[PDB]
Nucleic acid binder design. Structure first.
Ligand SMILES: Nc1ncnc2c1ncn2[C@@H]1O[C@H](COP(=O)(O)OP(=O)(O)OP(=O)(O)O)[C@@H](O)[C@H]1O
Ligand SMILES: [Ca+2]
Ligand SMILES: [Ca+2]
Ligand SMILES: [Ca+2]
Ligand SMILES: [Ca+2]
Ligand SMILES: [Ca+2]
Ligand SMILES: [Ca+2]
Length: 901
DNA sequence: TCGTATAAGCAGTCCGCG
DNA sequence: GCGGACTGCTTAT
């Protein structure tokens, strides 16, 4: 096989590399790598090395990495650019793996672990590590085994061995329901004392040294706790055995409001799954407890027990250990679905970076661009200091608040990356400037043509047309990968709808799910077999189709994230190729394209309807337009349609055969006007929306910018079995809105869009009457809690104290003295409830940690003093009033003359 | 919240508005 | 009461 790296580190003048050799075996080596850097030189000096602007360079080979580093400093002292890859391990990888890396994940050791620590005096601080580690479960991907290290004897209690037989049994048998599929993969090891547990763990770690290390909060809790505990008991040198090169570093993480410390383990790549999830999941969750995320992702029940966790080990050690094991498995189950480890490995090896660097698009793109240029013997520029400066972004059209019956939407495929490619926007392709006219003169095609030589953006920038820049070239490669995976995702989505249709008529029989690839549209043969299948087999196929769709979504949306973050990196001062001329060239061109094509679509539709000056485009944001189709539907007559799906086909056909060709012609003219390198503005139809045929549903509505709702029948070629609500920005989409309120507001919207005013009125009346029975957690608001200390004046609200912070301070007073009650953590999220006048907490609200029940001693009082009237008005009635006034209807029936009878 | 970008919505505080 | 200046938080893109 071809060799590939696992990890790489610089330690002084040595590179330390773990790698898989040509026989598929893990190896480690120390290499005294001699890096090269570059300086500009005279023309007469013959070289093969040139900077990105074509200026000749001489290569300087250093005796060691420390010499290169000192050379860079002295070059700053002189005032001259020091060119080349200053991160030497990236140069090492580039030299050592000078080909497209083909990696074999089965050879990479991925470890997933979790520890338990009993603590009677509140949260066990990792930096202190003053309590015994009483359980470790460590899963190894190569052995496919869960290794369990169990402490039987502790100052906080002596206990019996955990029983795998009881673990396996059902909850209803008194067991722990550890999944049967992992029961045989558990290797259980009990210990008399913590010292021998820990020494054994280190010996094990030496044998099975993680390459990728993950888990839930491992970077912030598990790793620092284990490191600092071993340090306290045995000393530093022993603690550093967690690094295969015996080197670690205490690493301070800073933000605007304080800082914390992590432990960097040299020769390990730590990918904490909580951070993978936050970056790549495209969710914003009320809570990030493993319990909460597992429930959301997997539909598994909460891991239930009696009493506080601080007494779980001594009261029920059996369950204590079983829940440690299940916690580890939960993360593997989330990854099986979401596939973020797979994503990270793909991106990391593509870029030739340390795998943990996938969190930084700046590092990722610096490595991609360096490797690309190095192939052509070109030399990268030195990074420079820049002050942070604002710059302008996208155009967003102000909609007229209203109901909108029939809507068709279009938007650009990979908008900003396509602009980069079309205009040829790159550091080394800047050709000059031209004198800019007001943006509207370009939009209306009345400004002078910018250039007859170079490719232009309306911000005044001109670019070379004779060859692609390195940014367009590399962004295209990742864009093409994105396109492939989006295709797989959309096929899986279409296949899912075929299964849902067939579930209307499930056959009474015993049979199996078909063995099919859900990434490709089902053949006619597969479709015929599906119509004969039972509900059980269809349901299992639907689940598999939906897992394939999720796998496709992860691959495509995060490749989209990566290329969009290259645009964004151009406006970040730490990026080697930072340049606000290029960032604004992209955003300003985007503004023009949107309003240019708005004009063209309006002109086109006014033409086919024989009107003048009528506005068919009702809204747009960044690179999308929403088109009113009422007049198109009315030109045929609603009476002519057999059913909903009939007019959806008609609009689908109109969009593809009439609108898109008009859109394409409009952008071809704009490309020539700007003299761009290549026409890449491709604005595909997205949504087809309207009410069910013959209903009183309103179809859709807008309240304002970034706030709308549409009843969609077809989305990018997916024809739904049942219409789907596309709701953007409204309170149903906000993590701050209470769960039960999201649900009720969504049903009100469904009724508005599908059934009409009377249906909405019936549902409102009922919700208002019954909502006081809703569980308190379901009706709590949610907020992040920053700067709690800033607003704490003697345990009371200081000036301008935010409502949610006030709630936290109220909580802090109510639990004072207790080292047992849960503390609210700075920067994490809280549930919030209003309180009726004259309550015992002495203020108008209370907040507590999100994803948890409020502690029992104040729970009853909170439940008794909850202000349901305020909660209803603020979270439900206010937003609904906004939706309904925008849609021009009433959520409460108005009086009439018929009331006289 | 260590980790690419800007535009823009709503909740709430503080206080003016005769 | 509303709305402007401001902070805080959370979306759409
Ligand atoms: N997270 C982001 N960071 C930087 N720019 C973004 C981000 N999200 C969107 N944009 C910018 O807005 C443009 C339009 O976004 P949109 O959500 O329509 O996705 P897109 O990149 O056009 O891809 P698609 O083909 O899925 O529409 C992007 O091309 C860019
Ligand atoms: Ca635990
Ligand atoms: Ca787009
Ligand atoms: Ca699209
Ligand atoms: Ca059937
Ligand atoms: Ca869009
Ligand atoms: Ca009480």
């Amino acid at each position: 096989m071809k060799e590939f790296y696992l990890t790489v580190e610089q330690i002084g003048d040595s590179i330390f590399e773990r790698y898989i050799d040509s026989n598929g075996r893990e190896r480690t080596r120390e290499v005294e790598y001699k890096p090269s850097l570059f300086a500009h030189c005279p023309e007469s000096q013959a070289t093969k090395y040139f900077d990105i602007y074509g200026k000749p360079c001489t290569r300087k080979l250093f005796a060691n990495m420390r010499d290169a580093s000192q050379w860079i400093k002295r070059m700053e002292d002189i005032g001259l650019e020091a060119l080349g890859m200053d991160d030497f391990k990236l140069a090492y990888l580039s030299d050592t793996y000078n080909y497209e890396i083909k990696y074999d994940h089965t050879k990479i050791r991925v470890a997933n672990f979790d520890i338990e620590v009993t603590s009677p005096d509140g949260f066990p601080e990792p930096s202190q590590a003053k309590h015994p580690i009483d359980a470790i479960t460590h899963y190894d991907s190569i052995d496919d085994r869960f290794y369990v290290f169990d402490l039987l004897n502790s100052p906080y209690g002596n206990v019996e061995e955990w029983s795998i037989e009881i673990a396996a049994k059902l909850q209803e048998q008194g067991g722990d329901e550890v999944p049967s599929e992992i029961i045989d993969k558990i290797i259980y090891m009990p210990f008399d004392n913590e010292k021998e547990l820990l020494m054994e763990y280190l010996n094990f770690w030496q044998q099975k040294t993680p390459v990728i290390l993950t888990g839930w909060n491992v970077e912030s809790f598990a790793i620092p706790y284990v490191y600092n505990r071993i340090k306290n008991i045995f000393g530093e040198s022993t603690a550093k055995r967690l690094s295969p090169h015996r080197k670690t570093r205490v690493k301070v993480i800073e933000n605007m409001y304080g800082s914390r410390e992590i432990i960097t383990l040299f020769g390990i790549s730590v990918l904490d799954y909580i951070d993978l999830y936050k970056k790549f999941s495209f969710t914003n969750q009320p809570s990030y407890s493993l319990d909460y995320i597992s429930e959301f992702e997997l539909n598994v029940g909460k891991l239930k027990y009696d009493g506080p966790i601080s007494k779980l080990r001594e009261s029920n050690h059996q369950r204590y250990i079983s829940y440690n094991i299940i916690a580890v498995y939960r993360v593997l189950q989330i990854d099986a679905k979401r596939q973020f480890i797979n994503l990270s490995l793909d991106m990391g090896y593509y870029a030739k970076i340390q795998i943990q660097s996938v969190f930084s698009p700046i590092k990722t793109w610096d490595a991609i661009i360096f490797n690309s240029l190095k192939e052509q013997n070109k030399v990268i520029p030195q990074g420079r200091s820049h002050p942070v400066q604002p710059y302008p972004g996208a155009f967003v059209k102000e909609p007229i608040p209203n109901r909108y019956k029939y809507v068709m939407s279009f938007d650009l495929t990979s908008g900003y990356p396509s602009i980069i490619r079309q205009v040829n926007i790159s550091p080394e392709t800047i050709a000059g400037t031209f004198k800019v006219a007001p943006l509207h003169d370009y939009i209306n095609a009345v400004a002078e043509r910018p250039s007859d030589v170079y490719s232009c953006s309306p911000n005044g920038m001109m670019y070379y047309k004779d060859r692609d820049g390195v940014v367009p070239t590399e962004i295209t490669k990742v864009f093409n990968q994105r396109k492939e995976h989006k295709g797989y995702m959309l096929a899986a989505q279409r296949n899912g709808e075929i299964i849902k249709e067939a579930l209307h008529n499930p056959n009474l029989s015993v049979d199996e799910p078909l063995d099919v690839d859900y990434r490709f549209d089902f053949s006619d043969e597969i479709k015929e077999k599906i119509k004969k299948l039972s509900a059980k087999s269809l349901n299992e196929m639907l689940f598999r189709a939906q897992r394939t769709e999720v796998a496709g979504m992860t691959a495509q949306i995060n490749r989209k994230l990566l290329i969009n973050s290259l645009y964004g990196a151009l406006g970040n001062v730490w990026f080697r190729y930072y340049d606000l001329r290029n960032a604004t060239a992209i955003t300003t061109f985007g503004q023009m394209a949107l309003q240019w094509i708005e004009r063209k679509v309006n002109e086109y539709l006014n033409e086919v309807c024989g009107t003048e000056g009528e506005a068919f485009v009702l809204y747009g944001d960044t690179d999308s337009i929403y088109v009113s189709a009422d007049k198109i539907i009315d030109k045929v007559g609603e009476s002519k349609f057999r059913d909903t799906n009939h007019w959806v086909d008609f609009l689908d056909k109109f969009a593809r055969e009439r609108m898109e060709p008009a859109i394409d012609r409009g952008f071809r003219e704009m490309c020539e006007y700007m003299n761009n390198k290549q026409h890449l503005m491709f604005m595909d139809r997205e949504a087809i929306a309207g009410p069910p045929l013959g209903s009183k549903g309103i179809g859709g509505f807008w309240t304002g910018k970034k706030r709308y709702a549409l009843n969609v029948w077809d989305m990018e070629g997916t024809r739904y079995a049942e219409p789907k609500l596309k709701i953007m920005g409204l309170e149903t989409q906000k993590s701050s809105t209470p769960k039960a309120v999201q649900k009720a507001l969504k049903e009100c919207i469904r009724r508005m869009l599908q059934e009409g005013e009377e249906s909405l009125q019936e549902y409102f009346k009922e919700f208002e009457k019954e909502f006081r029975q809703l569980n308190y957690i379901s009706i709590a608001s949610v907020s992040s809690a920053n700067n709690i200390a800033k607003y704490d004046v003697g345990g009371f609200p200081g000036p301008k104290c935010p409502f949610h912070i006030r709630g936290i301070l109220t909580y802090n007073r109510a639990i004072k003295g207790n080292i047992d009650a849960p503390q609210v953590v700075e920067g994490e999220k809280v549930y919030v409830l209003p309180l009726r006048e004259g309550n015992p907490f002495g203020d108008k609200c209370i907040a507590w940690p999100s994803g948890t029940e409020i502690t029992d001693l104040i729970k009853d009082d909170v439940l008794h003093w909850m202000d349901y009237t305020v909660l209803l008005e603020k979270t439900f009635i206010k937003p609904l009033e906004g939706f309904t006034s925008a849609a021009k209807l009433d959520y409460e029936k108005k009086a009439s003359l018929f009331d006289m009878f």
